[PDB]
């Protein structure tokens, strides 16, 4: 290693001593990737070993297994786990590959070449060499595009992916006609983030997901090819700071945005995050509660359409601010919800009174009751229910865990982007270690008013 | 000598000779903040009642409608609207716009953009003056707290009506309803935030008293020591060694700070981390991850329940829960 004597960086900032050491930096990155794969495999093995078939996935605190279920692995019609062997296979493969990755990282960090700019010119680089950095960026863009295309191939030729909107209940479908319309793809991208619109979180069928992935794979491959063959222009050289910490800050900001988007998608989406494996969402539980109370009160001989509440608005059915027929109560704020068990009862102008008066199905009622009781509310020590409940239920929704953790991560990485962007801009200018007593900039300016 | 129109405009915008720095972040900051300020003042003085719960029960919050400074507020947007975008041009008339709670959304959006631009402008002036750019990182804690109470909590609860009102009694109502629904007092992140503010006050008083106690004599007894300090002077005006000796005899030698830079970094770091954690706690509780629930935890041999201070707190929460909205509920569970 090194020391503060010959570096100027303390032990709590020791990873900054390998900014200009290409081999050791590569070793550190490979070791970290091995750590990530190790966690994936170990967590998959931990979750597969603690899974019982008498309870749904969201009732047992699983977050990695529902990811494999949505890919159509070991699941059946209706969203019931049938086989649990592919999860074991995936976990074993990840855990074993982590060993190779960790060995590579340890080798490159301990006994590998310290600075690979003289023995391996192809892999060597300088942070200020724009062409080499752009070439590396293009290579990794090509790799990511290949990964997106690999995801696309699964839904088409290798058995497909789980579709929660499939006719006759959710099942593993095959996507034959993806939506590759420019108007459809641009509609999701340049949509408002507010209610009703929802930006890209509002994607409501797997055809749109597969079409967007085709688009993103093609774009990434083309951009990688473009960057391999070119170098930044004058307007780009005039606008950016060119150093390793600057590149790190850019990446930190990008992945902070990604983390916030992931949190929102986990909280709100139902297509890519089926409720069969993640439980009901926020609005879904409220809509289910109103639906089941309407059904129960209708079974007791009541007129749900003409029933009037304490405020005079409607106990079960009211009108949305645009005219659509929606559920009444405080769930009037969640009328944008759209779920597979509720859509069949919805007509062109909202809920159909005759359909919910004569054509409500027992499976719909069971889904509504289950999503009502398993609402995404809980406590830090995993106690289900509102904050004024008793210790009877040990449950916290998998959506809550992912949403909270990823919001925290996104905020902290935004703060990291701020820190590193500021430090890079200051260090490149040349005053990151303090002000110069001999030449203080403020002393040379005219005093203010 | 600048000649182009754009070159002259850039030189003026990025000028360090202005009385108040403009910058490129100030270009975004000034109009949004002015818009929010104007709408806030006009609504606080003369706005009509706003239907906040969507149950056709308007709530008054304006001075002209029988309120004082303590009672006045800006009522959040209607519950019927939800998270929908409600700009001024989406209303049939200004009378309808003021009845549903448009000004709250307008002010909230403009204020969020303005505070983000304010932090950016802090960085910008730090760069232009030749400083180190982390006063902006310090400001990120109050920025995150404001974002959490104004944006993230409505985002997770599905409506802007669950947002914090722009008033005093409205703030107290927000706090009480938050306690009744999430048990915020039992949240470790709220405990960390309380520790942060209490420690910030402790250390501010401690540092101020220690510096004021070691002033070197440069005046007489008929004038203040502030007259003993001269602006722009080069020599230090107090005895760091004397203050360190006093503190190290007060507790013990290796508890005080012999390094002024390290002491000031600790002063900066404590409250910032505390507020970061409390804002993270609010944002986490937005997605319904409440605090510790030690209700009916102590049980005797025959199975009966032995109560605790946690159970008394639960009784208070039950008291303030069944009354936070009297007529807005038709079903037993407050799932939102």
């Amino acid at each position: 290693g090194r020391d503060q004597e010959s570096t100027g960086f303390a032990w709590w900032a020791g990873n900054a001593r390998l900014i200009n050491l290409s081999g050791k930096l590569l070793g550190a990155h490979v070791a970290h990737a091995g750590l990530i794969v190790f966690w994936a495999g170990a967590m998959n093995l931990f979750e597969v070993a603690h899974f019982v078939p008498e309870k749904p996935m969201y009732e047992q605190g699983l977050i990695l297994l529902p990811h494999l279920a949505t890919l159509g692995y070991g699941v059946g019609p209706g969203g019931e786990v049938i086989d649990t062997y592919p999860y074991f296979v995936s976990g074993v493969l990840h855990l074993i590959s982590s060993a190779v990755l960790g060995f590579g990282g340890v080798y490159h960090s301990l006994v590998g070449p310290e600075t690979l700019e003289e023995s391996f010119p192809f892999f060597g680089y300088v942070w200020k060499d724009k062409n080499k950095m752009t070439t590396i960026l293009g290579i990794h863009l090509i790799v990511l595009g290949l990964g997106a295309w690999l995801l696309v191939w699964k839904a088409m030729y290798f058995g497909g992916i789980y579709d929660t909107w499939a006719p006759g209940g959710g099942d593993v479908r095959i996507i034959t006609n993806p939506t590759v319309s420019p108007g459809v793809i641009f509609g999701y991208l340049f949509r408002s983030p507010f209610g009703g619109d929802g930006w890209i979180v509002s994607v409501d069928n797997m055809e749109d997901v597969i079409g967007g992935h085709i688009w993103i794979g093609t774009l990434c491959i083309f951009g990688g090819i473009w960057h391999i063959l070119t170098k930044p222009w004058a307007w780009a050289r005039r606008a950016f700071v060119w150093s390793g910490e600057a590149y790190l800050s850019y990446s930190l900001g990008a992945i902070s945005i990604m983390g916030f988007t992931a949190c929102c998608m986990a909280w709100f989406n139902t297509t890519a995050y089926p409720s069969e494996f993640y439980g009901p969402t926020g609005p879904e539980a409220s809509q289910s509660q109103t639906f089941t109370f309407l059904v129960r009160d209708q079974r007791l001989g009541a007129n749900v359409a003409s029933a009037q509440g304490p405020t005079g608005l409607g106990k079960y059915l009211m009108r949305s601010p645009t005219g659509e027929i929606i559920f009444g109560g405080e769930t009037m704020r969640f009328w944008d919800f759209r779920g597979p068990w509720l859509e069949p009862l919805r007509g062109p102008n909202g809920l159909d009174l005759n359909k919910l008066k004569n054509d409500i199905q027992p499976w719909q009622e069971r889904r509504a009751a289950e999503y009502m009781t398993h609402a995404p509310l809980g406590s830090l020590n995993s106690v289900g229910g509102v904050a004024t409940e008793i210790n009877a239920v040990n449950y916290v929704s998998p959506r809550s865990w992912l949403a909270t953790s990823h919001f925290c991560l996104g905020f902290f990485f935004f703060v990291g982007h701020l820190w590193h962007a500021g430090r890079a801009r200051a260090a490149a200018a040349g005053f990151e270690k303090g002000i110069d007593r001999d030449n203080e900039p403020v002393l040379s300016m005219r005093p203010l008013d | 000598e600048s000649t182009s129109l754009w070159a002259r405009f850039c030189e003026w915008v990025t000028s360090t000779e202005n009385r108040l720095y403009i910058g490129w972040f100030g270009v975004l900051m000034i109009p949004t903040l002015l818009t929010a300020t104007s709408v806030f003042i006009i609504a606080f003085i003369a706005a009509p009642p706003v239907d906040i719960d969507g149950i056709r029960e308007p709530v008054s919050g304006s001075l002209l409608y029988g309120n004082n400074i303590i009672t006045g507020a800006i009522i959040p947007t209607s519950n019927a609207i939800g998270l929908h975008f409600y700009p001024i041009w989406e209303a049939a008339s200004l009378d309808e716009w003021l009845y549903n709670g448009g000004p709250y959304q307008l002010i909230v959006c403009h204020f969020f953009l303005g505070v983000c631009s304010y932090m950016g402008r802090e960085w910008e002036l730090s760069f232009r003056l030749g400083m180190r750019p982390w006063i902006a990182v310090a400001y990120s804690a109050p920025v995150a707290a404001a974002t959490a109470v104004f944006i993230i909590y409505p985002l997770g609860q599905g409506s802007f009506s669950d947002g914090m009102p722009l008033g005093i009694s409205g703030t107290f109502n927000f706090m009480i309803v938050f306690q009744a629904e999430h048990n915020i007092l039992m949240h470790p992140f709220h405990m960390l935030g309380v520790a942060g503010v209490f420690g910030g006050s402790l250390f501010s008083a401690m540092h101020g008293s220690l510096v004021t106690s070691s002033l070197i004599r440069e005046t007489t007894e008929n004038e203040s020591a502030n007259e003993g300090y001269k602006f722009g002077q080069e020599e230090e005006t107090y005895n760091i060694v004397a203050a360190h000796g006093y503190f190290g005899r007060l507790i013990f030698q290796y508890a005080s700070f012999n390094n002024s830079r390290s002491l000031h970094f600790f002063l900066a770091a404590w409250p910032v981390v505390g507020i970061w954690f409390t804002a993270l706690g609010i944002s986490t509780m937005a997605f319904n991850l409440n605090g510790f629930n030690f209700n009916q935890s102590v049980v005797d041999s025959q199975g009966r329940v032995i109560n605790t201070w946690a159970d008394i707190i639960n009784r208070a929460n039950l008291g303030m829960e069944v009354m936070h909205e009297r007529n807005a509920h038709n079903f037993p569970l407050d799932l939102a």
Binding site: P447 | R19, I45, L63, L64, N68, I69, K230, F231, G232
Partner: peptide, 30 residues
């Protein structure tokens, strides 16, 4: 009647803030 007093108090506070910002005693380097 009291609304006038409230508005006068707020306006006076804002005016004091404006005057403090734009009519301060300028610091001078010794």
């Amino acid at each position: 009647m009291e609304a006038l007093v409230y508005t006068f108090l707020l306006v006076g506070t804002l005016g004091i803030i404006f005057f403090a910002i734009f009519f301060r005693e300028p610091p001078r380097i010794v």
